[PDB]
Amino acid sequence: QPFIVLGQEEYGEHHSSIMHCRVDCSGRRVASLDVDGVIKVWSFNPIMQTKASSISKSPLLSLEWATKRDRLLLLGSGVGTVRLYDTEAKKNLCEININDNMPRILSLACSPNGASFVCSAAAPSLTMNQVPGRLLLWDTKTMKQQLQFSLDPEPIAINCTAFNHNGNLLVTGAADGVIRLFDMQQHECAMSWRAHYGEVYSVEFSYDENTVYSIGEDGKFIQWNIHKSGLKVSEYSLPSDATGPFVLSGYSGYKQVQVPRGRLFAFDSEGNYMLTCSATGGVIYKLGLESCLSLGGHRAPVVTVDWSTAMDCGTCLTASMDGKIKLTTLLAH
């Protein structure tokens, strides 16, 4: 058994389905956001308590902790704005309008070195997610746009972004199923390939950074070789409840339906294990791909996860459509 489960606790302060649930860079705080636009910032070690609690007037689509300034949280709205929120002082330092005509801020990634952030801003969904979008680099010192990257072949909505460890590479996944790797020294697309049939939902660098991992609408987890121009290394069909749509039905003829928006997978510190969503809780696999552990503890579908390691103890966040967030403590035996 590669982990001992030291316990499972529950944060229940949200009354609506969770959209995002992310541990901060210190590994000591969570920022969580539900579909009613309630943000909660809470600690959990050694006990859970709420440090800040606010309700967004604006609809929010994305959430990203700052790297070099621990207590800063970037919030991306659906009305074309980014709020830089100070979790300690419990106030915004600034809001910036990003771009006209592209109001959905679908993704935010703070540079490792703290000096920049990346911003994905998309057009309205059609009245589907096959719509133009832009990927933008912003200077954190001045909170102004540095540049707009090219998106070949055509502008499209980028859903997810992730930096490598030293911030010189950025991997991205788009609503057209395309992955793009950007070199952040020259600030250009180095590499692009068709990764999923349907949307890419999450991307991540492997620990050694020889491959990147994606998960997408076709229900697949795929590992790609970013030395050999995004040739497949390995591929797996996850159960359909790992990628949704996630559905909570009542006996009423009423139901809630959520498509992925927040992270769909998370990794241990060494990138040997991977947490995913399921109807009943988190499911952890060992990366080669075999099932390892089902964490359970949810009465509604899990729609987003996170995994943080500090002090070589793991914390797994699993967040469900009833607003419950489970916190499972893992120590590598």
- Which stretches of the chain bind ligand A1BBV, using CB under 6 A? 66-69, 72, 84, 93-94, 110, 114, 140, 142-143
Which CB atom, from 98 or from 284, has the smaller least distance to ligand A1BBV? Answer: 98
- Nearest CA among 32, 43, 112 for reference residue 310: 43
- Give min distance, CB of 30 to ligand A1BBV, in A: 18
Cβ 317 to ligand A1BBV shortest distance, Å: 21
Q: Give min distance, CB of 279 to ligand A1BBV, in A.
A: 36
Kindly state the smallest distance separating residue 60's Cβ from ligand A1BBV, in Å.
17
The least CB distance from residue 67 to ligand A1BBV, in Å, is: 5
Closer to ligand A1BBV by CB, 117 or 213: give it: 117
Give the CA-trace dihedral at 172, 86, 327, 273, to 10 degrees.
Answer: 30
Q: Check: CB of residue 246 under 8 Å from CB of residue 301.
A: yes
Phi-psi sector, 9: left (phi>0), alpha (psi -120 to 50), beta: beta
Residue 140 or 315 with smaller CB distance to ligand A1BBV: 140
311 CB-near residues (< 8 Å, 6+ apart): 27
Q: What share of the chain is helix, strand, coil (3-state, %, to 5)?
A: 0, 55, 45
Specify the residue, 80 or 260, whose C-beta has the smaller distance to ligand A1BBV. Answer: 80
Q: Minimal CA–CA distance to 277: which of 200, 198, 219, 204?
A: 219
Q: In the structure encoding, which two tokens stand for residue 9, read together?
A: 């606790």
Per the structure block, which two tokens stand in for 125? 């969904």
CB contact set of 34 (below 8 Å; sequence gap of 6+): 14, 15, 16, 17, 18, 19, 323
Q: How far is the CB of 208 from ligand A1BBV (least distance, A)?
A: 25
Q: In the complex with ligand A1BBV, which residue's Cβ is closer, 49 or 142?
A: 142
Give min distance, CB of 108 to ligand A1BBV, in A.
10
- Local structure of 272: helix, strand or coil: coil
Residues whose CB falls within 8 Å of the CB of residue 234, separated by 6 or more in sequence, listed in order: 222, 223, 288, 289
CB nearer to ligand A1BBV: pick between 85 and 224: 85
CA distance 1 to 275: 16
For residues 89 and 331, which CB has a smaller minimum distance to ligand A1BBV in the complex? Answer: 89
